[PDB]
Amino acid sequence: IAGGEAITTGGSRCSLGFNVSVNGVAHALTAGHCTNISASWSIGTRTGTSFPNNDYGIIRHSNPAAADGRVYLYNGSYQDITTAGNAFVGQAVQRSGSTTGLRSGSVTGLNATVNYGSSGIVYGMIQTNVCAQPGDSGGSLFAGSTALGLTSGGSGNCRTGGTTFYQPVTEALSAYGATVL
């Protein structure tokens, strides 16, 4: 299972962010607002979660063979991921998610504060003009083979377009001592 593909718990669905390694043990990063729901996922068991404030969480794979170090492009192809990096304003990026598939756009701001109402407030988010819809959360924000972020939330949709916010991947990686596969 690669970045952008569906992960579920009961009736809830999110998207996988990036497959990573923690001391050689395969895990998957996704949004924290997703992992707060349950410890039991289609792919394994939750081992960490942080939301709101941050928006990241990590799941240990039940099947290490499933930890595919790529992002699914929703066209029968995949993008290989080799490193993690920090986004910059004006950067051309792509987002992969289980509701709307693959979408492209650019980074329009950094360190954005986002109020999700009853769900709370998150800080330090990457802002983009890429659209997203419910179910896309946790999915991959990347630029070629460089991982950048995990879909958190936004406004609008993929028909009208909108604004989307992503948790920087490097903070989630350092939280857990993980490296991207």
Distance CA 165, CA 31 (A): 11
Label residue 23 exposed, middle or buried (CB < 10 Å: 0-12, 13-18, 19+).
exposed
Phi, psi of 26 (to 5 degrees): -70, 130
DSSP summary character for residue 74:
S
Distance CA 135, CA 128 (A): 18
Active site residue 55: yes
162-to-12, 58, 103, 112, 130 alpha-carbon distances in Å: 23, 27, 12, 15, 7
Is residue 146 a contact partner of residue 180, using CB atoms and an 8 Å limit? no
Closest C-alpha to 105, from 125, 126, 129: 129
* Experimental method, per PDB record: X-ray
Query: Which tokens hold the place of 168?
Result: 């920087």
Cis peptide before 52 (omega within 30 of 0): yes
Active site residue 136: no
Query: Which tokens hold the place of 66?
Result: 């499933």
Distance CA 128, CA 122 (A): 16
Q: List, in sequence order, every beta strand (DSSP E) within the chain.
A: 6-9, 12-15, 18-22, 25-30, 40-41, 44-50, 56-61, 70-72, 78-80, 83-84, 92-97, 101-115, 121-128, 140-143, 146-157, 161-168, 178-180
Say if 1-68+169-181 and 69-168 have the same CATH topology. yes
Closest C-alpha to 176, from 83, 85, 69, 49: 49
Distance CA 153, CA 167 (A): 10
Distance CA 177, CA 91 (A): 26
DSSP summary character for residue 129:
S
Distance CA 47, CA 123 (A): 22
Resolution in A, one decimal?
1.5
What CATH number belongs to 1-68+169-181?
A: 2.40.10.10
Which residues partner with 149 through β-bridges? Answer: 141, 168
Q: Which of 15, 137, 140, 152 is catalytic?
A: 137
Could you tell me the residue ranges of all domains in the chain?
A: 1-68+169-181, 69-168
- Identify the sign of the CA torsion 34, 35, 37, 41: positive
User: CA geometry: angle at 125 spanning 123 and 126, to 5°?
Assistant: 165
59-to-45, 73, 107 alpha-carbon distances in Å: 5, 22, 27
- Identify the sign of the CA torsion 42, 77, 75, 100: positive
Q: Which helix (H) or strand (E) holds 176?
A: helix 169-176
In 81-117, which positions are buried (b, 16+ CB within 10 angstroms) versus exposed (e)? Answer: beebbebeeebebbbbbbbbbbbebebbeeebebeee
Tell me the CATH class for 69-168.
mainly beta
Distance CA 156, CA 164 (A): 9
Q: Which of 15, 33, 96, 136 is catalytic?
A: 33
Q: Which of 27, 50, 55, 96 is catalytic?
A: 55
